[PDB]
């Protein structure tokens, strides 16, 4: 297991524009296209992202290309974030994947409500962190996925990903 296999399990792979768990136009391996309810806006974003007229459909290679970019940008975003970087740097590699997964799903603005969890993670108070992590809109809206990511934060193992 590594971050790609992990997020591939959590995000799935769909080659045509679909709506994510939040109802937002998405394609590929959790590549968010837009929050706009306008499908034409999403199709425009898609063509922009891929560099050709896709008419709402891409290939597996193109999905994986966006996925590579998206994972990379999540990591680079964490590293530029004054609040996230020291926590992330304190973590071992497996728990770092949990952090990337969370940011990938919810963005940095999302992981901002997680001040208390972040402190507990930095302190390596793993069971406390895991309890705090689950007290969230995140967990309640996507509980099976959040349980996997939280187990990853709690144990630093890939147990939840089989
Ligand atoms: C709350 O989990 C994180 C820890 C460190 C960096 C990013 C995170 O989402």
Ligand 1 centroid – CA 39 distance (Å) = 32
Q: Do residues 2 and 75 make contact, with C-beta atoms less than 8 angstroms apart? A: no
Whose CA is closest to atom 7 on ligand 1?
A: 99
Helices first, then strands: H and E counts in the chain = 9, 3
Whole-angstrom Cα distance, residue 62 to residue 98? 25
Q: How many residues does the chain have?
A: 162
Instruction: Kindly provide the b/e burial profile for residues 55-75, where b requires at least 16 CB atoms within 10 angstroms of the residue's own CB.
Output: ebebeeebbbbbbeebbeebb
Whose CA is closest to atom 9 on ligand 1?
A: 99
Q: Do residues 112 and 83 make contact, with C-beta atoms less than 8 angstroms apart? A: yes
Question: What 3-state class would DSSP assign to 155?
Answer: helix
How many other CB atoms are found less than 10 A from the CB of residue 37? 11
Whole-angstrom Cα distance, residue 88 to residue 141? 24
Residues sharing a CB contact under 8 Å with residue 122, sequence separation 6 or more, in sequence order: 86, 87, 90
Ligand 1 centroid – CA 12 distance (Å) = 22
Which helix (H) or strand (E) segment is 93 a member of?
A: helix 93-110
Would you say 132 is a known binding-site residue? yes
Whose CA is closest to atom 5 on ligand 1?
A: 88
Whole-angstrom Cα distance, residue 155 to residue 62? 34
Residues sharing a CB contact under 8 Å with residue 51, sequence separation 6 or more, in sequence order: none
Which helix (H) or strand (E) segment is 78 a member of?
A: helix 60-80
CA atoms within 13 A on the CB side of 52: 5
Classified by CATH at the fold level, domain 1-162 comes out as Lysozyme (1.10.530)
Whole-angstrom Cα distance, residue 101 to residue 82? 18
User: Within 6 Å (CB) of ligand 1, which residues are found?
Assistant: 78, 84, 87-88, 99, 102-103, 111, 114, 117-118, 121
Q: Do residues 30 and 20 make contact, with C-beta atoms less than 8 angstroms apart? A: yes
Give the distance, in angstroms, between the CA of residue 8 and the centroid of all CA atoms in the same chain: 10
CA-CA-CA-CA dihedral for 33, 22, 140, 5, to nearest 10: -40
Place of tokens 């080659």: 15
């Amino acid at each position: 297991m590594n971050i790609f296999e992990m997020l591939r399990i959590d995000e799935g792979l769909r080659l045509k524009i679909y709506k994510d768990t939040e109802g937002y136009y998405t394609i590929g391996i959790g590549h968010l296209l837009t929050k706009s309810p306008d499908l034409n806006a999403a199709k425009s974003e898609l063509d922009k992202a891929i560099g050709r007229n896709c008419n709402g459909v891409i290939t597996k290679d193109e999905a994986e290309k966006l996925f590579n970019q998206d994972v990379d940008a999540a990591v680079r975003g964490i590293l530029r974030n004054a609040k996230l970087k020291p926590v992330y740097d304190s973590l071992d590699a497996v728990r770092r994947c949990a952090a990337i997964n969370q940011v990938f799903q919810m963005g940095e603005t999302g992981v901002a409500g997680f001040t208390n969890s972040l402190r507990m993670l930095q302190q390596k108070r793993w069971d406390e962190a895991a309890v705090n992590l689950a007290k969230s809109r995140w967990y309640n809206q996507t509980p099976d996925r959040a349980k996997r990511v939280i187990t990853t934060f709690r144990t630093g193992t890939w147990d939840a990903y089989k």
